[PDB]
RNA sequence: CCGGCGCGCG
């Protein structure tokens, strides 16, 4: 067989400022969210209707309307408000800011690719440190190496005075620079192949010669591994420092808006100046927006409460991955307290009228309309709300053959959710079969269950042919039966099959019972109070010897001179003869063993006859 | 499970008779 | 004996839902009986559906 | 229709 090939993929990659612009194209320039009076989206703000899309689909910021492209006065599109959930914006940062994930997280990717200690980069980005010789692909004329913490006295007055201002600034950012701009310049002019070769040769030199002699090696292996991945992909190492800041769509942030304001609050302040301190404030605003809590003390709000960043909202047990994506709340679902029903079949459950009418509402509407008892959908829904007596006939009709899924709360294995055929029961409780309680680990002291309705034909087929209880009698753990009688049923069976009192518990003195043609006679005598449940009796047996008993020789053989002999065992009597081939069997038993055997036999025979 | 392995001549030409 | 009647009773626990209001961001059905919300199919319930192999029941409760 | 705090049920 040729496999039905399906080649589907998804990939993440570090994004480019050009791709950010293509997302937004659309720049958010003002930190205003809404008008204080009219509660309208402020233009160029975090909720700008021109940037992100029309609130109240098909209307402009002015108030015009068109049938569901751009307006002239306010320039708002004519589309659905769906776009406000997907359209991105961007913030044009005056200075580049590094991405916190790629600088502060350990081990730092920027530090390893640039090959400098992390404290040096942190001082360069946060403190007032200037880096010497940031780029190499352009010539220089100075002998400043490393990152001098102190400002160079000559570079402050002498060289700027000799080299004036315009040309000096023209060649300024080629020998000395500071902040994330220097880091981005270093990343942009990196030669990755040279990095790989230098790392390999240094690794060989170290090897040809014992803790940090190894840790330096692991850095070299890590760096050339990191350098290789940039060559074969389309990612650029300078994208780890951000030039633009994408903005979340407004409808996803109806806390986050506060952090977006601060970026605009401090970036628009910085562009007014154009100073070192304000550049750092913009960088910290982006870090708090992107990832709080990595920089030691996390920035708090006025209430001394830690802000929540995108990393916080995507990670953790309550994050997007583990709470919104791996589990969902669903429609066509109900819940109620479960009570025991011993008269139910193993494949049936009982549903309250309210839960059933809610879950099967659309099917009841179809049933109403189909037989001309409802003119339209609205009339049918009004009839359903009025609890008309004909709503329940249609509900009972449409529930036939449509399975439902029950589920108890702590689903520890797959038998924690099973499929049953719903029937309408009075009250407000879910009627549950007693033999399926062990699979659900359910008892009737306050437990509740959820109900789900498969809608499509494929789901109904799956529920009927895979999840019903009569095809799930074995547990997948070891293969043992899961629907075994327990407690009350087990006690009843034990009492039924506990035979006669024997020995000194039957007779007061040392002994120095009715005979029934068939089991029906014995059971009839029991019904007429002629015998007890455990009183001994002899039953004529006309089948093969199939009674479980100890493998023992007869207690006593009564051999007659005419040829017939009687063999007396502990639990049966066998009459044989030498003249004939006759062989009679009488079983010493009670009405209880007969009843158990007849129950199982009649179950088998009735199931066979019904098919 | 159920998702595995991706789940006119002879006309207008009769005998004139 | 002396038997008490407790607050935990039906008429305060029976809940049903066909469809209705959804969350503003996640667009999933609401949470809570008072809000006419739906029942949550968590990851442990998703594991059980994957144990049965019912891939189309699972997609209904996901999309 | 957003999050924290407190109290509960299985
Ligand atoms: Mg219980």
UniProtKB/TrEMBL annotation, chain A:
Enzyme class label:
transferase
Cofactor binding remark: Binds 1 Mg(2+) ion per subunit.
Sorted alphabetically, the keyword list is: Chloroplast, DNA-directed RNA polymerase, Magnesium, Metal-binding, Nucleotidyltransferase, Plastid, Transcription, Transferase, Zinc
Mind telling me which Gene3D superfamilies this protein's record contains?
Answer: 1.10.40.90, 2.40.40.20, RNA polymerase II, clamp domain (4.10.860.120), RNA polymerase Rpb1, domain 3 (1.10.274.100)
Name the family: Belongs to the RNA polymerase beta' chain family. RpoC1 subfamily.
The job of this chain, per UniProt, is described as: DNA-dependent RNA polymerase catalyzes the transcription of DNA into RNA using the four ribonucleoside triphosphates as substrates.
- Describe the subunit structure: In plastids the minimal PEP RNA polymerase catalytic core is composed of four subunits: alpha, beta, beta', and beta''. When a (nuclear-encoded) sigma factor is associated with the core the holoenzyme is formed, which can initiate transcription.
Write down what this protein is called.
Answer: DNA-directed RNA polymerase subunit beta'
Its source organism is Sinapis alba (White mustard)
Gene assigned in the entry: rpoC1
UniProtKB/TrEMBL annotation, chain B:
Q: Which domain of life is it from?
A: Eukaryota
What the record says about family reads: Belongs to the RNA polymerase beta' chain family. RpoC2 subfamily.
Name of the protein: DNA-directed RNA polymerase subunit beta''
- What species does this protein belong to? Sinapis alba
Function description: DNA-dependent RNA polymerase catalyzes the transcription of DNA into RNA using the four ribonucleoside triphosphates as substrates.
Q: How does it assemble?
A: In plastids the minimal PEP RNA polymerase catalytic core is composed of four subunits: alpha, beta, beta', and beta''. When a (nuclear-encoded) sigma factor is associated with the core the holoenzyme is formed, which can initiate transcription.
Q: Lineage from the top down? A: Eukaryota, Viridiplantae, Streptophyta, Embryophyta, Tracheophyta
Instruction: Kindly list the places in or outside the cell where this protein is found, as annotated in its UniProt entry.
Output: Plastid, Chloroplast
From TrEMBL, chain C:
Question: Which residues lie in coiled coils?
Answer: none
Where, per UniProt, does this protein localize? Plastid, Chloroplast
Which family, according to UniProt? Answer: Belongs to the RNA polymerase beta chain family.
| Known function | DNA-dependent RNA polymerase catalyzes the transcription of DNA into RNA using the four ribonucleoside triphosphates as substrates.
**Quaternary structure per UniProt?**
In plastids the minimal PEP RNA polymerase catalytic core is composed of four subunits: alpha, beta, beta', and beta''. When a (nuclear-encoded) sigma factor is associated with the core the holoenzyme is formed, which can initiate transcription.
* Protein name as annotated: DNA-directed RNA polymerase subunit beta
Question: To which species is this protein native?
Answer: Sinapis alba (White mustard)
């Amino acid at each position: 067989m040729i496999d039905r090939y399906k080649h589907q993929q998804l990939r993440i990659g570090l994004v480019s400022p050009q791709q950010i612009s293509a997302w937004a194209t659309g720049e958010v320039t003002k930190p205003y969210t809404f008008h204080y009076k009219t509660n309208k989206p402020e233009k160029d703000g975090l909720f700008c209707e021109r940037i992100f899309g029309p609130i109240k689909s098909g209307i402009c910021a002015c108030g015009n309307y068109r049938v569901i492209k751009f307006c002239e006065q306010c320039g708002v599109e004519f589309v659905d408000s769906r776009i406000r959930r997907y359209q991105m914006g961007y913030i044009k940062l005056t200075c580049p800011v590094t991405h916190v994930w790629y600088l502060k997280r350990l081990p730092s990717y920027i530090a390893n690719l640039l090959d400098k200690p992390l404290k040096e980069l942190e001082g360069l980005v946060y403190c007032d440190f200037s880096f010497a010789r940031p780029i190499t692909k352009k010539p220089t004329f100075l002998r400043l190496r490393g990152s001098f913490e102190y400002e160079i006295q000559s570079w402050k007055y002498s060289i700027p005075l000799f080299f004036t201002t315009q040309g000096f600034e023209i060649f300024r950012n080629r020998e000395i620079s500071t902040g994330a701009g220097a880091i981005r310049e270093q990343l942009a002019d990196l030669d990755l192949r040279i990095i790989i070769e230098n790392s390999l040769v240094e690794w060989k030199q170290l090897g040809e010669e014992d803790r940090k002699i190894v840790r330096r090696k692991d850095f070299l292996v890590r760096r050339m591994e990191l350098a290789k991945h940039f060559i074969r992909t389309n990612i650029e190492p300078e994208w780890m420092v951000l030039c633009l800041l994408p903005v979340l769509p407004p409808e996803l942030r109806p806390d986050i808006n506060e952090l977006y304001r601060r970026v605009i609050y401090r970036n628009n302040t910085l562009t007014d100046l154009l100073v070192m301190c304000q550049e750092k404030l913009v960088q910290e605003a982006v870090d708090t927006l992107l990832d709080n809590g990595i920089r030691g003390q996390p920035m708090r709000d006025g209430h001394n409460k830690v802000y929540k960043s995108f990393s916080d909202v995507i990670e953790g047990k309550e994050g997007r991955f583990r709470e919104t994506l791996l589990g969902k709340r669903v429609d066509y679902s109900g819940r109620s307290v479960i009570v025991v029903g011993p008269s139910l079949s193993l494949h049936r459950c009982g549903l309250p009228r309210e839960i059933a009418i809610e879950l099967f509402q659309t099917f009841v509407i179809r049933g109403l309309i189909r037989q001309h008892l409802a003119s339209n959908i609205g009339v049918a829904k009004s009839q359903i709300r009025e609890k008309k007596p004909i709503v329940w006939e249609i509900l009972q009709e449409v529930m036939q053959g449509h399975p439902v899924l029950l589920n108890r709360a702590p689903t520890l294995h797959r038998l924690g959710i099973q499929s049953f055929q719903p029937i309408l029961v009075e009250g407000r409780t879910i009627c549950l079969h007693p033999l399926v309680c062990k699979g659900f680990n359910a008892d009737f002291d306050g437990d509740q269950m959820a109900v789900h309705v498969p809608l499509s034909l494929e789901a109904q087929a799956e529920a009927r042919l895979l999840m019903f209880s009569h095809m799930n009698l074995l547990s997948p753990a070891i293969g043992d039966p899961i629907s075994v009688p327990t407690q009350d049923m087990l006690i009843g069976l034990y009492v039924l099959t506990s035979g006669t009192r024997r020995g000194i518990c039957a007779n007061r003195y040392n002994p120095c019972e009715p005979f029934f043609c068939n089991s029906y006679d014995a059971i009839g005598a029991y019904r007429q109070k002629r015998i007890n449940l455990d009183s001994p009796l002899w039953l004529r047996w006309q089948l093969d010897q199939r009674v479980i008993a100890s493998k023992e020789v007869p207690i006593e053989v009564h051999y007659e001179s005419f040829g017939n002999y009687h063999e007396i065992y502990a639990h049966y009597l066998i009459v044989r003869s030498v003249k004939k081939e006759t062989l009679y069997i009488y079983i010493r038993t009670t009405v209880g063993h007969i009843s158990f055997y007849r129950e199982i036999e009649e179950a088998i025979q009735g199931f066979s006859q019904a098919c | 499970g159920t998702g595995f392995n991706k789940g006119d001549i002879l006309f207008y030409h009769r005998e004139f008779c | 004996p002396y038997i008490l009647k407790l607050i935990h009773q039906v008429d305060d626990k029976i809940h049903g839902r066909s469809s209705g209001h959804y969350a503003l961001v996640t667009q999933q059905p609401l949470r809570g009986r008072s809000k006419q919300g739906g029942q949550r199919v968590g990851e442990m319930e998703v594991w059980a559906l994957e144990g049965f192999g019912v891939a189309h029941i699972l997609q209904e409760m996901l999309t």
